[PDB]
Design a protein around this nucleic acid. Structure first.
Ligand SMILES: [K+]
Ligand SMILES: [K+]
Ligand SMILES: [K+]
Ligand SMILES: [K+]
Ligand SMILES: [K+]
Ligand SMILES: [K+]
Ligand SMILES: [K+]
Ligand SMILES: [K+]
Ligand SMILES: [K+]
Ligand SMILES: [K+]
Ligand SMILES: [K+]
Ligand SMILES: [K+]
Ligand SMILES: [K+]
Ligand SMILES: [K+]
Ligand SMILES: [K+]
Ligand SMILES: [K+]
Ligand SMILES: [K+]
Ligand SMILES: [K+]
Ligand SMILES: [K+]
Ligand SMILES: [K+]
Ligand SMILES: [K+]
Ligand SMILES: [K+]
Ligand SMILES: [K+]
Ligand SMILES: [K+]
Ligand SMILES: [K+]
Ligand SMILES: [K+]
Ligand SMILES: [K+]
Ligand SMILES: [K+]
Ligand SMILES: [K+]
Ligand SMILES: [K+]
Ligand SMILES: [K+]
Ligand SMILES: [K+]
Ligand SMILES: [K+]
Ligand SMILES: [K+]
Ligand SMILES: [K+]
Ligand SMILES: [K+]
Ligand SMILES: [K+]
Ligand SMILES: [K+]
Ligand SMILES: [K+]
Ligand SMILES: [K+]
Ligand SMILES: [K+]
Ligand SMILES: [K+]
Ligand SMILES: [K+]
Ligand SMILES: [Mg+2]
Ligand SMILES: [Mg+2]
Ligand SMILES: [Mg+2]
Ligand SMILES: [Mg+2]
Ligand SMILES: [Mg+2]
Ligand SMILES: [Mg+2]
Ligand SMILES: [Mg+2]
Ligand SMILES: [Mg+2]
Ligand SMILES: [Mg+2]
Ligand SMILES: [Mg+2]
Ligand SMILES: [Mg+2]
Ligand SMILES: [Mg+2]
Ligand SMILES: [Mg+2]
Ligand SMILES: [Mg+2]
Ligand SMILES: [Mg+2]
Ligand SMILES: [Mg+2]
Ligand SMILES: [Mg+2]
Ligand SMILES: [Mg+2]
Ligand SMILES: [Mg+2]
Ligand SMILES: [Mg+2]
Ligand SMILES: [Mg+2]
Ligand SMILES: [Mg+2]
Ligand SMILES: [Mg+2]
Ligand SMILES: [Mg+2]
Ligand SMILES: [Mg+2]
Ligand SMILES: [Mg+2]
Ligand SMILES: [Mg+2]
Ligand SMILES: [Mg+2]
Ligand SMILES: [Mg+2]
Ligand SMILES: [Mg+2]
Ligand SMILES: [Mg+2]
Ligand SMILES: [Mg+2]
Ligand SMILES: [Mg+2]
Ligand SMILES: [Mg+2]
Ligand SMILES: [Mg+2]
Ligand SMILES: [Mg+2]
Ligand SMILES: [Mg+2]
Ligand SMILES: [Mg+2]
Ligand SMILES: [Mg+2]
Ligand SMILES: [Mg+2]
Ligand SMILES: [Mg+2]
Ligand SMILES: [Mg+2]
Ligand SMILES: [Mg+2]
Ligand SMILES: [Mg+2]
Ligand SMILES: [Mg+2]
Ligand SMILES: [Mg+2]
Ligand SMILES: [Mg+2]
Ligand SMILES: [Mg+2]
Ligand SMILES: [Mg+2]
Ligand SMILES: [Mg+2]
Ligand SMILES: [Mg+2]
Ligand SMILES: [Mg+2]
Ligand SMILES: [Mg+2]
Ligand SMILES: [Mg+2]
Ligand SMILES: [Mg+2]
Ligand SMILES: [Mg+2]
Ligand SMILES: [Mg+2]
Ligand SMILES: [Mg+2]
Ligand SMILES: [Mg+2]
Ligand SMILES: [Mg+2]
Ligand SMILES: [Mg+2]
Ligand SMILES: [Mg+2]
Ligand SMILES: [Mg+2]
Ligand SMILES: [Mg+2]
Ligand SMILES: [Mg+2]
Ligand SMILES: [Mg+2]
Ligand SMILES: [Mg+2]
Ligand SMILES: [Mg+2]
Ligand SMILES: [Mg+2]
Ligand SMILES: [Mg+2]
Ligand SMILES: [Mg+2]
Ligand SMILES: [Mg+2]
Ligand SMILES: [Mg+2]
Ligand SMILES: [Mg+2]
Ligand SMILES: [Mg+2]
Ligand SMILES: [Mg+2]
Ligand SMILES: [Mg+2]
Ligand SMILES: [Mg+2]
Ligand SMILES: [Mg+2]
Ligand SMILES: [Mg+2]
Lengths: 134, 260
RNA sequence: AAACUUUCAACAACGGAUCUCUUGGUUCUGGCAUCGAUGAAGAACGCAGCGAAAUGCGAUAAGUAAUGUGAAUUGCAGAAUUCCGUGAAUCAUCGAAUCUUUGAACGCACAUUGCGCCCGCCGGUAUUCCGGCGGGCAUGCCUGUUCGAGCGUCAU
RNA sequence: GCGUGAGCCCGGGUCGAACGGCCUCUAGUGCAGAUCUUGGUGGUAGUAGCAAAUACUUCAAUGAGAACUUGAAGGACCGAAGUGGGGAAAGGUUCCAUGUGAACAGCGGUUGGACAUGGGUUAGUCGAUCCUAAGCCAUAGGGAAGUUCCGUUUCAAAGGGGC
RNA sequence: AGACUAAUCGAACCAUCUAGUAGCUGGUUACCGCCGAAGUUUCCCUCAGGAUAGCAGUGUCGACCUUCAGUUUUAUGAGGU
RNA sequence: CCGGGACCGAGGACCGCGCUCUGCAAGGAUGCUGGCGUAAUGGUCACCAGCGACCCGUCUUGAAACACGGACCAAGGAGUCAAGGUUUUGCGCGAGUGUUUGGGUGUAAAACCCGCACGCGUAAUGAAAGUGAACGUAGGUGAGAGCUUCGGCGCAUCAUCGA
RNA sequence: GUUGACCUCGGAUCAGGUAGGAGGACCCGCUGAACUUAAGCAUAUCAAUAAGCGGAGGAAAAGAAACCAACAGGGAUUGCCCUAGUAACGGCGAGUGAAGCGGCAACAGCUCAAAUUUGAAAGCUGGCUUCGGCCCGCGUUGUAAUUUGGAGAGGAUGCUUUGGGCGAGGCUCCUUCUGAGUUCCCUGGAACGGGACGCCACAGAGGGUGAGAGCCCCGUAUAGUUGGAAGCCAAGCCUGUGUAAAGCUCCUUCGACGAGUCGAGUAGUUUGGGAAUGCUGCUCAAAAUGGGAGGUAAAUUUCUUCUAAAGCUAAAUACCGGCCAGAGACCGAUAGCGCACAAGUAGAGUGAUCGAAAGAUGAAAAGCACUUUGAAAAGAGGGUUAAAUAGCACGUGAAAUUGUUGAAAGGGAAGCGCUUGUGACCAGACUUGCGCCCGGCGGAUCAUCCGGUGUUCUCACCGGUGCACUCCGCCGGGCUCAGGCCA
């Protein structure tokens, strides 16, 4: 149960905030879990998904398929992964939208800022446990 | 709202125009022109006797009658047949009233939810806790839109002494569904007879049971009531020698034979 | 006997009731005190790669600077960054700026994109005329400065 | 199938996300009428009618389709106080060219003041701008609790010309 | 001409007081069970309206109070049709 | 004292009143036999036949009325809420009763706790100054449920004479 | 005569400033109705209200007694409870109506005029300025210090009081970080459903994800933790010093105190205010132990209590108009605001103003490629989808009213009640059950006794014994009894 007076538990207000969120908030809403190997390597459990990293599908009809993230369509709350597609009546190929909460990241795109994210969350995630241990 | 249905300037057309007498909107060029207004029978009108905020929402109860009812509920909580008739599962509890030693008092004695859950199982309260977990449904109407989505059953109530036990056990029992806590000196009739039905299942602590008599001694203007009868067992009275020896002989049987 | 009229069922029509849904209302409770001559509230006209409205903005015009975040926007297209460092975005924040014509509205007017005056710079032979550009000129009242009026009135 | 009754329960079809029994609590709680309110739909009925302003006919072309589209040839009307040629008030693109399924032109339509896409208004001499009329409003002053009323030369120290 | 003052004139049009008042006309929503009327008295600027008594229902309490009666009989009064 | 027909069979161990007394017609139907075991009995609907049957709501002494409203269908549509009185039902305490204007406290608009004043009641009567409820086992007489040592004691309430 | 002042009144696009408009829910004033009730109506009521006008703030206003009282006396203002539907007003009709005392919320006090600094205008706006001051001006028709009735001034008397600077530490705001299954089987287009096995919990609030998810994602609990800014409070330390200024105790004597104001008459309005409660107009118009009040007009004599005609000031109280936030036994698209949508919009009126209708394909557009008939709109095939009985005239799809197919009736209405008939369609009920005897088949262990354990203390259960005329089950044959409908 919630305690603090600044927190609201209202169905009407919660749906409004979700479906009208700006772009920098939609980034955090679209997160995915890491795989067991990466989770052990980095001591991180989840991260916002980015274009240019590998993924495996674990729910829905397109299960056990893999590929790279080709686009993050924040206005639709879906992602596109290469080679998971469909054909129109004319025979043209069109991608299928997958919600990022039923994939697992098996390899992540890395740069200077991405490394800062992973280091920052890890340091806090272990400081909490160290203080909790007393 | 105070002004709903009265934000127009309608006036009756009077008799002679072959229409019913009722205020009608004035103007032209819209659908709204010429339509009825101000009535409780009219679309977009005003309702009959609009509701006000100065109706009585609260009720005053004599404090003596409050104290009578809470004492009557405590007595009913020590009758095992009444516990079963209110839906509680108590087939494996050793005694009623159920009292546990002060092993729930120390710093972090049951301050973890895992520890508190483990203690309820050993004592014999486990089946009543699992009854709540398995009962959970979606509410069956428009209450879902208004913040009340689910319904479930009630479990045991835990009574403790905040002065001796330490009040840290509230954290441990809070997250388990169905379990409530209350101090011994602030007992609540809403929890002791939920829904107006008697026989709540209660788990006491040793320190709390010792304090219960001192609590009732210090209530100015209240004393425990006297009953209107003295022996509640009706069969002992009727079938005693004092009464059966002075009766007249029976005039008939439970079934009368038909004559003519 | 058909056709016609009437009653019931199945399928097909007309119409939008019923059931379920809700980024909207309504009522209560708690916190805070901040418009304008340094030009407000309101009105008009414009601004996008492809827009009529709605939303945003003002010739720096679907926005500029600055700070944070860290890879998009998306109906189409192109292009940019692609996180090296020089940094996507109708993102968040917001302390520096721009801010057309009006409006208490202020050179005089206005049913007119009407008619004047003062100071300076630049051109045309020019202190005086014509054109371009910049800065100015409302009313009531207060304190001070300076120039005055009156046998109101003092001394010489 | 049950119930004197208001009603309750089951079978068959359609459909797609929530719902009921029992004891208490609570109310914006039960419709045929009010020339009742809002919305939808009949008979009448393929009915009343589509008759002022004299009037149309032949050939060819276009087109799926021609009485009311275009060419030529006949027959007619308005008869200079015109059914002609230009303006003021008012409207605001109705003007021109190309093209077009539906809707509109109370019959039709290949035509249109309709629908879509583009184009079109050039002044020192014609107007406005300048002057005053009937009138309206500032300034000096006087009323009115006040929004404001009167007052237009007055019981005012009210200007402009040169070097 | 009681004529005209935007299809409005024996006192225009618009918003508000305003859900103005009506002893007067119209309407007023499921079922079964038991009981069951009045249009008469007195007063009122009272006569299409009220108060007041009567007629009706519901809740009870006192005893299950030799208790009563829209009737006959016997004795005994009053009356001017 | 003998015949002939029609309709009906409630009840469910024994018990009673009786008689013509191995038993019976006496406090309510049994015995024997045939056909058929399914649409045969039974039920729903449609239609013909015999008898019966004026349009509802409303005002009115009187409505089927030549008295008014009503073409049809769906959804909406009218004795409520507050303060102040009163009688009656249920509940707590009882010569008293009432926490909640406020304070304490809290798992925080809930629940729990506190007590100084105050309201109603405990005494009336006069315009007012004012005064202010026992002769008696809290009286006598007639009724009176219940109890009773059978002599009486006598609730509630009614009528009556007194303080 | 010249020149130089002062007083009053003016000019300037002189130097520097300031007001108007919006908003108006709540606040401070002015002005001012009628509908209605009185069963008619004029005083009355509605109401010291609606409409109209002026002026402010986060609150405004009020406020430190010319008060209440009649006591053994209280002691600035405001608000709640009570006083109290009371005293009183009123065609004494309908109706109206306060205050003192008492308990609580919140608490806080002050400064001018009237005196000679007179051994020294000791005071202030503006300009320029090394920053230290200088210069003009205001002002003696009065700018500072001193005094405000609680006092005070003027004298005695001898004790006491004060100025600067650091400052640990804490509080408020922003920001970084936070536990646990996508384990196995079934249905399904898709598990977020059912079954099995686990884990977290100071976190089982809420929302999303292809259907009801504590452990898939955002968040939710707890004290902490990385970084940044500005304020406030504050334990305790380091320093001067009496030129000056301040408090207390006593006293002969002094002791200034607001004028067309108070008060009186009269007129109007208002109040519960009654020979007149407040306000305003006109006429008259004061005083020094004087003046006001002391709820019945007047004269005489006492008593009580304050100190008018000048001024400032936080809190408890009102309000959802403005900017934010949290909620509910409220409404669910003819409801709820007029507006869930490009709504104060489209549209009407010369104008002031009036003012609607209108939400829902599917998880995903995968929004129908190709062939064929047609001038075209479209149709027929063929595709997508879990579904086109979801095709943008899109969830579900009722009634009035209409088309086709099928059944039936009809000599100037139809519909309805009771009761047979015919045709069509249909729910039940019945199918066997218990018992006895004979035979076959299989399994035990039936009665009794010993040990243990319960329990209603005499009744049972478990282990051992039993071992074929006992006990249990099945099958085959015969017999009695009971069983459905109409007679
Ligand atoms: K209105
Ligand atoms: K008519
Ligand atoms: K709990
Ligand atoms: K609905
Ligand atoms: K715009
Ligand atoms: K002009
Ligand atoms: K079905
Ligand atoms: K036709
Ligand atoms: K003609
Ligand atoms: K002609
Ligand atoms: K010109
Ligand atoms: K020229
Ligand atoms: K012009
Ligand atoms: K000109
Ligand atoms: K003139
Ligand atoms: K004026
Ligand atoms: K008009
Ligand atoms: K009448
Ligand atoms: K006679
Ligand atoms: K009977
Ligand atoms: K009637
Ligand atoms: K009729
Ligand atoms: K009562
Ligand atoms: K009392
Ligand atoms: K007796
Ligand atoms: K001057
Ligand atoms: K309001
Ligand atoms: K006003
Ligand atoms: K009193
Ligand atoms: K000086
Ligand atoms: K002074
Ligand atoms: K510090
Ligand atoms: K599957
Ligand atoms: K699966
Ligand atoms: K499951
Ligand atoms: K006076
Ligand atoms: K005096
Ligand atoms: K007096
Ligand atoms: K509406
Ligand atoms: K218009
Ligand atoms: K399915
Ligand atoms: K299909
Ligand atoms: K569908
Ligand atoms: Mg998923
Ligand atoms: Mg009107
Ligand atoms: Mg409404
Ligand atoms: Mg429902
Ligand atoms: Mg501006
Ligand atoms: Mg410009
Ligand atoms: Mg200029
Ligand atoms: Mg000025
Ligand atoms: Mg759905
Ligand atoms: Mg209703
Ligand atoms: Mg109806
Ligand atoms: Mg009716
Ligand atoms: Mg015809
Ligand atoms: Mg014609
Ligand atoms: Mg004609
Ligand atoms: Mg023609
Ligand atoms: Mg002619
Ligand atoms: Mg001619
Ligand atoms: Mg043309
Ligand atoms: Mg054309
Ligand atoms: Mg036509
Ligand atoms: Mg046509
Ligand atoms: Mg055409
Ligand atoms: Mg056009
Ligand atoms: Mg000219
Ligand atoms: Mg004027
Ligand atoms: Mg003037
Ligand atoms: Mg006219
Ligand atoms: Mg009404
Ligand atoms: Mg009316
Ligand atoms: Mg009867
Ligand atoms: Mg009279
Ligand atoms: Mg009548
Ligand atoms: Mg009696
Ligand atoms: Mg009786
Ligand atoms: Mg006579
Ligand atoms: Mg029988
Ligand atoms: Mg037979
Ligand atoms: Mg039959
Ligand atoms: Mg008949
Ligand atoms: Mg007749
Ligand atoms: Mg009538
Ligand atoms: Mg009619
Ligand atoms: Mg509805
Ligand atoms: Mg100047
Ligand atoms: Mg203003
Ligand atoms: Mg009224
Ligand atoms: Mg009246
Ligand atoms: Mg009347
Ligand atoms: Mg009248
Ligand atoms: Mg007003
Ligand atoms: Mg302000
Ligand atoms: Mg305040
Ligand atoms: Mg103030
Ligand atoms: Mg004073
Ligand atoms: Mg005193
Ligand atoms: Mg006081
Ligand atoms: Mg009282
Ligand atoms: Mg009162
Ligand atoms: Mg009054
Ligand atoms: Mg002093
Ligand atoms: Mg002194
Ligand atoms: Mg987390
Ligand atoms: Mg869901
Ligand atoms: Mg969830
Ligand atoms: Mg699961
Ligand atoms: Mg004074
Ligand atoms: Mg007045
Ligand atoms: Mg007066
Ligand atoms: Mg809300
Ligand atoms: Mg609708
Ligand atoms: Mg609506
Ligand atoms: Mg729909
Ligand atoms: Mg097709
Ligand atoms: Mg379906
Ligand atoms: Mg349709
Ligand atoms: Mg549909
Ligand atoms: Mg139909
Ligand atoms: Mg028939
Ligand atoms: Mg054995």
């Amino acid at each position: 149960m919630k305690v603090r007076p600044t927190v609201s538990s209202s169905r009407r207000k919660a749906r409004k905030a979700h479906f009208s969120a700006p772009s920098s908030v939609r980034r955090v809403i679209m997160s995915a879990p890491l795989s067991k190997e990466l989770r052990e390597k980095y001591n991180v459990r989840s991260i916002p998904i980015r274009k240019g990293d590998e993924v495996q599908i674990v729910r829905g009809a397109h299960k056990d398929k893999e590929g790279k993230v080709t686009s993050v369509y924040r206005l639709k709350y879906v992602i596109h992964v290469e080679r998971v597609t469909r054909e129109k009546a004319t025979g043209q190929t069109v991608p299928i939208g997958i919600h990022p909460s039923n994939v697992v990241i098996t390899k992540l795109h890395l740069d200077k800022d991405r490394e800062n994210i992973l280091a920052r969350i890890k340091a806090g995630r272990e400081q909490v446990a160290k203080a909790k241990g007393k | 709202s105070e002004k709903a249905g009265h934000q127009t300037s309608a006036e009756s057309w009077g008799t002679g125009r072959a229409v019913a007498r009722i205020p009608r909107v004035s103007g032209g060029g819209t659908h709204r022109a010429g339509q009825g207004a101000f009535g409780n029978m009219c679309r977009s009108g005003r309702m009959f006797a609009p509701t006000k905020i100065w109706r009585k929402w609260h009720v005053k109860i004599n404090q003596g009658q409050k104290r009578f009812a809470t004492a009557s509920a405590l007595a009913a909580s020590a009758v095992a047949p009444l516990l079963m008739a209110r839906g509680h599962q108590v087939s494996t509890v050793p005694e009623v009233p159920l009292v546990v030693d002060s092993a729930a008092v120390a710093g972090d004695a049951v301050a973890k939810t895992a520890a508190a859950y483990k203690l309820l199982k050993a004592i014999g309260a486990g089946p009543d806790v699992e009854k709540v977990k398995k009962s959970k449904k979606l509410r069956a109407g428009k209450g879902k839109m208004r913040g009340r989505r689910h319904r479930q059953r009630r479990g045991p109530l835990i009574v403790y002494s905040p002065e001796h036990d330490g009040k840290e056990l509230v954290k441990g029992f809070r997250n388990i569904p169905g379990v409530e806590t209350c101090p011994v000196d602030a007992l609540n009739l809403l929890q002791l007879a939920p829904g107006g039905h008697l026989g709540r299942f209660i788990v006491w602590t040793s320190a709390a049971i010792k304090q219960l008599d001192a609590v009732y001694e210090s209530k100015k203007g209240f004393f425990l009531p006297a009953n209107i009868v003295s022996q509640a067992d009706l069969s002992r009275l009727i079938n005693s020698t004092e009464i059966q020896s002075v009766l007249r002989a029976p005039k008939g049987e439970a079934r009368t034979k038909r004559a003519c």
